[PDB]
Design a protein around this nucleic acid. Structure first.
Length: 81
DNA sequence: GTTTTCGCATTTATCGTGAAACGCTTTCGCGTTTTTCGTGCGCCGCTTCATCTGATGTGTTGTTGACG
């Protein structure tokens, strides 16, 4: 089948090796979740935070659908294999 | 009078010189040649991501408690 841009997006996380002093003063290693268009490989959105949790995923998704919209056939992949 | 030597003349030979000629080797000059050197890109293979980061021992100082 033919894959359109925005038709299939993959979500992935990343743990940073950089020490950052956050807004609350604590020095932590940030974790960022990214949404990527599978066809073009363009990163469509991200959210960074102090730990891995659903909020960054949810909000980065919000950023993606607010900026580029929701396609009529929408596939989302998060590989938990 | 006949022959032989002696004095003078003309022609040819050659030198010493000076400027020039040729012929050999040496270079440089320029057009076309040959190698080396950089800059440049594309391909292939290896490796990590699909989840990744900090301590100990001894000395000195500060604070707090006890004692005078």
């Amino acid at each position: 089948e033919h894959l359109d841009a925005m038709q299939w997006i993959n979500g992935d996380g990343y743990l940073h090796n950089v020490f950052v002093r956050w807004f609350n003063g604590d020095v932590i290693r940030p974790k960022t979740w990214f949404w990527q268009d599978v066809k073009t490989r363009k990163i469509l959105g991200w959210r960074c935070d102090v730990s891995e949790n659903i909020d960054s995923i949810r909000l980065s998704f919000m950023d993606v659908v607010t900026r580029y919209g929701i396609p009529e056939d929408f596939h989302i992949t998060i590989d938990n294999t």
